[PDB]
């Protein structure tokens, strides 16, 4: 119903790399259409953002959850 993409309000993100940021949105429409938006950017230096990694992401067919937890942030205990 409502064949129209919502306004999709969101920070739209801006910084990538300094923190782990992976954006994959794959839309499969049984009508025969298929678009794939993929953007993997992982800090190539250091690798320690948000006390570990800002946002985790994962790989969903279209949308539903990150199989992790957005805004991830916690102390890695102490080896």
Tell me the HSE value of 68 on the side-chain side, using a 13 A CA sphere: 14
Structure-token pair, residue 27: 């839309």
**For residue 56, what are the contacts with CB-CB under 8 A and spacing of at least 6?**
20, 66, 68, 69, 70, 72
Structure determination technique employed: NMR
Return the residue matching tokens 């102390």.
75
Return the residue matching tokens 């409502």.
2
Distance, CA of 79 to CA of 77 (rounded, Å) = 7
Quick one: which of 49, 27, 54 has its CA closest to 38?
A: 27
- The domains of the chain are located at 1-79
**Distances, alpha carbon 45 to alpha carbons 12, 14, 17, 57, 65, in Å:** 24, 19, 9, 20, 28
Quick one: which of 9, 27, 11 has its CA closest to 19?
A: 11
């Amino acid at each position: 119903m409502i064949d129209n993409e919502k306004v999709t309000s969101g920070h739209t993100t801006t910084t990538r790399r300094s923190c782990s940021k992976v954006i994959t949105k794959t839309v499969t429409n049984a009508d025969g259409r298929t678009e794939t938006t993929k953007e993997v950017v992982k800090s190539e230096d250091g690798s320690d953002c948000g006390d570990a990694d800002f946002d985790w992401h994962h790989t969903f067919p279209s949308r539903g959850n990150l199989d992790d937890f957005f805004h991830r942030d916690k102390d890695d205990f102490f080896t």
